[PDB]
Structures are given as C-alpha cells and as structure tokens.
Amino acid sequence: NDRKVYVGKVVSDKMDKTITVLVETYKTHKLYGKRVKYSKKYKTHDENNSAKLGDIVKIQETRPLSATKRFRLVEIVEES
Amino acid sequence: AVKIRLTRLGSKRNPFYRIVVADARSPRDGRIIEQIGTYNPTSANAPEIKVDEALALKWLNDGAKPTDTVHNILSKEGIMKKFDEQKKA
Amino acid sequence: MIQQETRLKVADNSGAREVLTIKVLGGSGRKTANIGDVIVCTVKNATPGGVVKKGDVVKAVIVRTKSGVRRNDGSYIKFDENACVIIRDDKGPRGTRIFGPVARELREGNFMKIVSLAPEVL
Amino acid sequence: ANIKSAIKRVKTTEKAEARNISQKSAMRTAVKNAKTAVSNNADNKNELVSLAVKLVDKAAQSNLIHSNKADRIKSQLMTAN
RNA sequence: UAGGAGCUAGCCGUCGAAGGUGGGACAAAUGAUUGGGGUGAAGUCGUAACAAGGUAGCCGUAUCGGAAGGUGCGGCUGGAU
RNA sequence: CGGUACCUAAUCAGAAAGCCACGGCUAACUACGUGCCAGCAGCCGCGGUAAUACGUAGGUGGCAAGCGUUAUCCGGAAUUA
RNA sequence: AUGGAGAGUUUGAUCCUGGCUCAGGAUGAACGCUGGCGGCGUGCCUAAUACAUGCAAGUCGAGCGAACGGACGAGAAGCUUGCUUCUCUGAUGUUAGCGGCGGACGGGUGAGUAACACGUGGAUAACCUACCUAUAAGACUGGGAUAACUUCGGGAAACCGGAGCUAAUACCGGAUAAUAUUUUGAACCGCAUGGUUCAAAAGUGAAAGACGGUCUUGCUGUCACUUAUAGAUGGAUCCGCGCUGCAUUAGCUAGUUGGUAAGGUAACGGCUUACCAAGGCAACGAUGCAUAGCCGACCUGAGAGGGUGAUCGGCCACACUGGAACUGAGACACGGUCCAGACUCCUACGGGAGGCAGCAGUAGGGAAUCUUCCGCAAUGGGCGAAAGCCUGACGGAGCAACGCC
RNA sequence: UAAGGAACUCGGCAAAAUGACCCCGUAACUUCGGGAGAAGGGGUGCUCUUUAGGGUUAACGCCCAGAAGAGCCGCAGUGAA
C-alpha cells in the first residue's frame, strides 16, 4: 500500500543529504488530564536536498535506506 | 500440520472439550488458530456435538487435516458427510 | 637440587601458588632435595578461596625439578621449572587436580594418588 | 545417558557434511577460479558461465544454497555477461 | 608424475575468548586502639535558662573557658523603665 | 483411576471441636495467693497485704476445626491532599 | 457516581497542628495448641547451590544390504522311528548398519535483560518458510562405493588404531521446459522505485519400493520424488506511544556523526572496509550508575486507580562456564560436535567418562513448601497406511486444614 | 660458572643488575614550584619500493628519513665501548 506519511519542519540538514525535521504534539498526564506539549524528531532522508530552512516538510516513512534514513520526502512548502 | 484437536475444560475427572483447529507444534492447551465448536462425549447419553462446519470447508481444503479421533466424529455426526459433497467439487 | 630458601611453584589446586622451603627432611645435615623427596615449606602466595592459606607451614613432595634425575639405564630427564605438591602426611594430596607432567620415580615412594591424577607421568 | 540417536547423528552428519563439503567446497572452488577466470575477457569470456551458471544452480537444485543466493550469483555473473 | 590451478598439509600477518600479571579504581568485611552520639542509672557537682529567675533576650560573628558560660561588634523584639 | 466413588440393609444416640480476655475502649466476674514481686501490656495502664488487670479456678462471650501469635500489601486516611 | 463513619494520643483545663497507634480485610504464609469426613485448588518464595541412582525422543522390511536365529519341503536315516545332523524353499523377528524424518516438540527456569524486551497501533515498494492442502511441470541416464564379512593390533578395561570386501527409494556425473536470470520497450507512488505482460544467451529435476488387479504393469493408489504458483505456519526486519530511580551522575559519542564505493542479508545500511566536515548526542538529564524478564492477569480501591505474578495464560532469555562452527527448512542445538576453563567420577595407571533449571529422589541452606508413586485408559504429539514404541506430556493416586464449600 | 638466590654478614660490604636515543604512560603528598627520568610499558639491523618529509630541495636524486608498506638474516640489531 502506502507507508506512514507524517509531517514535520527542519532543524538541521546534516552534511550530504540528511535533513532532520521536527515533529511535536500534545500528550497528557492521565492522572491529571492536563495535556502538555512534547516533541519527537523523526529524521527523514532528503533525496536531492529538496527541503530548506523554515519548510514545514511533510515526509513519508520507508524501510531503512541507512542507519537513520527511515523516512523519505514528498512535500515541501516554503523557505525563510 | 495445522489440525483439529480436543482442548478440554471442566473440574476434577470431568472434561469439557471445545474443539480447536491449530498447529501440531503448539501444546494441547496452547495458543490456537480457530475454536470452532465443542464436544462433550462424556455424558450419560449424548456426545453434545455442537459444530459450525462452515470453516471446515476452508481449512481442510488448504492445509488442515483431521487426525484419527477428530476425523471420525465428523464421519459420525456427519460434519465431513456434508464435506463429502464439498470435497466432491 | 632444592635446598633451603628456594621457591617452588605449586602444581596442584590446593590454593597455594608459591612455596618457600624451610627444611629438607631426611638426615642430619642433608643439604639438597630432588624429585621424590618430601620438604617442609611455607606458602608465600595463595589463591583466594582455597584450602591452604598464606603463612601456613605445610609439607610437600617434589615433582619436576630443573636439574632432574638420572635413571638406571643412563637416561636422564630434566624439566623447565621446579614444582611441588602439598601432601597430607599419609602421601595423599591436599588438592584434587595436578597440573603438568610428573616424573616416573614418584611411584617408588608410593605416591600413587599423585601419579594417578597427573596428566601423563613421564 | 546419551541415546543412540546422538551417537548416530554425529557420524551421519560427519558423512553428510562430507557430502556437504563435497559440493559446497567444490562450489567454493568454483567461486575461487571460475569467478577469477570469467573476468578480464579471457578465452572463454562468454562461455565460462556454462560451467558457472551450471554449478551455482547445481547448488540450487539441491539444498546446498539459497535460490536468492543463486540469484545473487547471476547478479554479478551476468552483469559481466 | 600428480608438476601447475585449486585442495589436505605448509608457512605468513589481522582480529580473538579466557588467561597471565600489571597498575590502579570501586565495593564489602575485619582490625590492637580510638571519639562523637543514643538509652539507662541520672551515682556525682553546679544551678546556667523559665519569675526584670538575683547580672533581659536572639541571630550572624569572634574570642576565651573543660563545660556552663565570658566578652565584643552590626542587626532584630520574640523585653522591663 | 476402581470395585474406589454410589446404592442397600444391619449398627449404638455410637468414637469428635478448641482458644483469648472478662479493667475503658469491648458484649463475656468473681474468690485464693500476690505485695510494683511473679508477671500481663494494642493506647490509657494493673500489682506497694482488701488486683475485677498478674498467677491460680466456675460462669459466660465472640465462633467454630479452629483459636492465637508473628511478619507482609490495602482500606480505614484527602500524613502526597 | 451502590462508596467515603473510625478508637486514642501533647493539660491543671481547652482549640488547632502533627505524626504515631489499633479496630477491618487479605497471605504460596509460617509457628504454638487443636483436630470428623468428603467435594475442591495450590503446592523450595531461600542456593541459576551441588548431585548417586532410576529415567525421561523416538520412528519405520511396505527402503536394501546384510548377517544371526529360525518356522518352512527338508533326503538318506544319526536306525537311539526321531529328529531337520545336510541341502535349498527360507517367512517373520533379531539385529546392527547404511536411509529418510525427528532433534528447535512436549518439559523446566527467570540469571541476564530498564530494553522494541514486552504490551499495543501500524508497515515491508526489505521478507522467508521443510512438512500440510490445492494448483501445473513430470519422473530419461549411467553409477562407484559403502558399513555389514574377512584380517592385524591394543587394552580387565571402556572403545579404538589398520588391510581387503557389500545393497539401496542412500549417493554422484550427462541433456530436458519453467514469473529463475541480466540485456532490449509499453504500468504509478514511496524520490529511489513498482506493475505484468513483454523477449532473449540461458537454467535441471528425477525414487524407486510393498502391492488391489492388471499387462511378468498402470494411472504409479500408497509415499514420495523435483519444477512454477498459491493457501498456511511461525519467525524476521522498521516507526508510533505505555514502560524504575540517582545531577551527592552534565557535557556524551570519534566508524561515532551524515554522505561516498565493495560486500550480503529473505533485505537494509557506519555493519566493516578506503574518502570527506567535525559533526552528531545532549539539563526535555544524552552519558553512566543501581535495580528488575515484560504484558495479560491478580488484588483492593467511590471513581480518579495503582501495588502481586506462587498463580494461570501469551511473548522474551537460559540450559557447568565462555567461545567457534556444523547439520538441518528451522540451532549457533536442555539427554549434538570442537576449543578453552573450572569441578566431579572410574581405573588393571593404559586413558576413559560427566553436566538433574526434563520427573521423583539426595544433601545443603531455610521457618517451610509433595511419593527414589501408578497407568498411558482418555487426550495430545512424534515417525510409520495401519498396527506398534515413546510419553517422568498427560490422566490419576499419595501427603499437607495451607486454603475454599 | 650447574642448581639454588642474601640462606652470607654487625650490615647485601663487595660485585652483579640499571644505563644512550625515540614513543606511550605516570601515584600519594605538596609551600602549587615540585614529587618526576616516579613507578611502569614498548621500539632500534639490512635491502627494496614511496606517497613524502628535515628537505640537499633544484626533487624524488644529496644524506638523514616523513614515516608507511613489502621483504632478508642472525642465538642476539644503541650487536663493541
């Protein structure tokens, strides 16, 4: 079928085609019910250095092309 | 292979089998594939055969085998007797 | 040719490693011991755990000397190090295993238990 | 108290591995030389594979090797061919 | 011939568990003796604090005195005239 | 498993409950020693020659093949609110 | 929202605040004393301490050599008129091999593991799969050995060292077709890439038995056999989150951190190797320490829930220790191999052996936790058509008020 | 100078052992200088490649090497002092 197609926004493109987008959302204490923001970066493989600084990058997961490269690029919107 | 068996219940010296078609590599009370029906032959009269024979049409046609005591209540109650025409396809 | 003050490595598992010899048993004035003789000795280096402890005064039998023995047919056998085995004053060992080869003349002093346990008697 | 299967298996797997080191070593003979002789555009620059693709499927026609390894063999063999 | 190619064998260097010590590090146990603490008996001496408890306290600090306390300098009342 | 279970008959009213207090908590008390002694002791506490509290013995009481002690998690407890 | 009161306790006497204490439940409980019977569960919690013995995985003459015994016609009679003393018809069984399967199952344990391990939700355009079931390709060729038998030796030993021999559905060489395969073009999502026809050098099977009756065999039924799909099994790989505490652990890493090329895996890459920048990881506490298999489940809580795991199930890890491999579809294998180590045992002293965390039993420690028990009748599994064996799985008996009626 | 290694002796007296250069590493304690060359480890000949240092640089050639690979010899490579 497909694979998982989560979104993000870059933090640091590593040298030679490794961008690192940032995902963050809101989990709760189930004892309290109060949700709180929390982050979890999922590092995507950029195929051709497509994404830029400021880009709210939507990515898509793959099977590992390398040690960290679990996600591949579909959508990039803007740049600063 | 995957096969129908006799997985029991009940208190001391009194079994309550609910049948299970699953692999022979599992133990006799292990994790299963499908709990089809029950069979309590230990009564005063009846064998209490409850059977949903709709899924024997699947599994006996692509890998499950009846094995030497679960085979011949199907030849007794008539579960495989309906399969006799269903194997005649 | 083991005399007073020499150090012998211990060839069993009784917990001693090094031993210093105090006397050569025998007669008055007997100066040197060789393969098959019984010496009395101190343990200068022990293995943790172990039956015999540092500072103990034991007796041992000499297997293996560096200047070994002459036999009756004029053949000789020498070894590369001096070793001993701590005994139980009935010529039984205190350990349970023997490491290394052991001279044949140990059978003449009736140390049969040592001779049996050893890897090949030479 | 080891049963007679354990004393029987060690000798039949002595001789079955002697049949396994018969052909796999002969295949690892073949990947030492027929690999080294198909290259550099030799005399049999395109006919050496008629023993190579013969024997690496002789390992595949029995339980000697995985078929994808035989597929892995033709990957680097027929790229040269 | 079994010479090449390979193979058994032969050497030749990379990595190895364990070992061997080697230094330490860390942890635990023990150690002739010791010194702070707790409990009891408070055996004993003194009466400091509570009555402006016979010559108000309290903190930071500093010094002496075995200790209690003694004094001194800033600050506080949680004190009499 | 097992002639075990079960059914018939015969049988004697047959052969079988134990334990802690009897102070206030808490329903179950009174005499002998006893003299802060023996000792009990969940908190408060009893005994110094008139103890209901100790120890000795009849009643009962709580409830049954258990009763009591010991240690261990939770409620009682909103001392993690 | 079926629950949520408590009893005391600072005085000469009150209010607050405070901890502390008991009343109430449960325990794999155990102990002092007691003890009717059944119907029921649970049963070393400590030493993953060490082990004597029994003893626990086998399988098939319907594979085919053997060889043995041997019924089997079994002479002349050995004249003791009864056996076979001979021959061959010699079955079946024994052997003990060669052979295919199994050994990774059933069983036991929680040391390691604070982690993708487990739980739970996804994913593979990186997935494998003997046997089983269905699907089609079909079963041509030659074949040495080779244990067994003879022969030499060791040792009480154990079990070996050498010389010549033997069958196969065992085994190995010759060509046969397949979505094999890398060379040429037309599918869409996940950049890479896929998708199902394409069209081509290719690629090689192969097993024959006891037999129904026929044809002195044929579809090979049986039961396989090897070629291209599937169904299944269990396992693999990859991201979500739930997952102990210490900063009296703050700076963590340097094949590390990304990429660049070879491997190779069922596939992936820093996984390793030659290259490039110091990068990447971090106080949101990386790092390290200490502790602990995980979950379901238990349990009591009004709910907010969180503590147990003997239980009873599902998954992971382990099999004297520590390494390396083989074989097998599946192992780095609990009653396989080798190495190294530590312990233990037999000896005729020459060298031989063993790994109870499979079920009882023994010692130990402990406060304490089952009989060196029975039977496979049921079930369930193993190889065999079946019959048969193995069940120390299981089904029962023992023993215990330890607990429930 | 076999084996042994302070058993000698008032006493390890005398002798033996250590030693150059290069590379790795190094404690307690301190007056913060040190301790320190702590201790403790490893290396060293010759030939050929070479990519390249001090460069002899003109450049490898001219010697030591930049120091890396591959070799050869001996019981031993600062082979003596």
UniProtKB/TrEMBL annotation, chain A:
Transmembrane segments: none annotated. Gene3D superfamilies: Nucleic acid-binding proteins. One of its GO terms (molecular function) is rRNA binding. GO terms for biological process: translation. Keywords: Ribonucleoprotein, Ribosomal protein, RNA-binding, rRNA-binding. SUPFAM superfamilies: Nucleic acid-binding proteins. It comes from the Bacteria. The keyword Lipid metabolism does not apply. InterPro entries: NA-bd_OB-fold, Ribosomal_uS17, Ribosomal_uS17_bact/chlr, Ribosomal_uS17_CS. GO terms for cellular component: cytosolic small ribosomal subunit. Part of the 30S ribosomal subunit. Belongs to the universal ribosomal protein uS17 family. NCBIfam families: PRK05610.1 (NF004123), uS17_bact (TIGR03635). One of the primary rRNA binding proteins, it binds specifically to the 5'-end of 16S ribosomal RNA. This is Small ribosomal subunit protein uS17. It comes from Staphylococcus schweitzeri.
UniProtKB/TrEMBL annotation, chain B:
Keywords: Ribonucleoprotein, Ribosomal protein. The keyword Ribosomal protein applies. This is Small ribosomal subunit protein bS16. InterPro entries: Ribosomal_bS16, Ribosomal_bS16_dom_sf. Belongs to the bacterial ribosomal protein bS16 family. One of its GO terms (molecular function) is structural constituent of ribosome. GO terms for cellular component: cytoplasm; small ribosomal subunit. It comes from Staphylococcus aureus. The keyword Ribosomal protein applies. It comes from the Bacteria. NCBIfam families: S16. It holds the Pfam family Ribosomal_S16. GO terms for biological process: translation.
TrEMBL record, chain C:
It holds the Pfam family Ribosomal_L14. It comes from Staphylococcus schweitzeri. One of its GO terms (molecular function) is large ribosomal subunit rRNA binding. This is Large ribosomal subunit protein uL14. Keywords: Ribonucleoprotein, Ribosomal protein, RNA-binding, rRNA-binding. PANTHER family: 50S/60S RIBOSOMAL PROTEIN L14/L23, LARGE RIBOSOMAL SUBUNIT PROTEIN UL14M. One of its GO terms (cellular component) is cytosolic large ribosomal subunit. SMART domains: Ribosomal_L14 (SM01374). One of its GO terms (biological process) is translation. The keyword Acetylation does not apply. The keyword rRNA-binding applies. Part of the 50S ribosomal subunit. Forms a cluster with proteins L3 and L19. In the 70S ribosome, L14 and L19 interact and together make contacts with the 16S rRNA in bridges B5 and B8. PROSITE patterns: RIBOSOMAL_L14. Belongs to the universal ribosomal protein uL14 family. It comes from the Bacteria. InterPro entries: Ribosomal_uL14 (IPR000218), Ribosomal_uL14_bac-type (IPR005745), Ribosomal_uL14_CS (IPR019972), Ribosomal_uL14_sf (IPR036853). Binds to 23S rRNA. Forms part of two intersubunit bridges in the 70S ribosome. HAMAP family: Ribosomal_uL14.
Automatic annotation (TrEMBL), chain D:
Pfam families: Ribosomal_S20p (PF01649). One of its GO terms (cellular component) is small ribosomal subunit. Transmembrane segments: none annotated. Keywords: Ribonucleoprotein, Ribosomal protein, RNA-binding, rRNA-binding. GO terms for biological process: translation. One of its GO terms (molecular function) is small ribosomal subunit rRNA binding. Binds directly to 16S ribosomal RNA. Belongs to the bacterial ribosomal protein bS20 family. This is Small ribosomal subunit protein bS20. It comes from Staphylococcus aureus. The gene is rpsT.
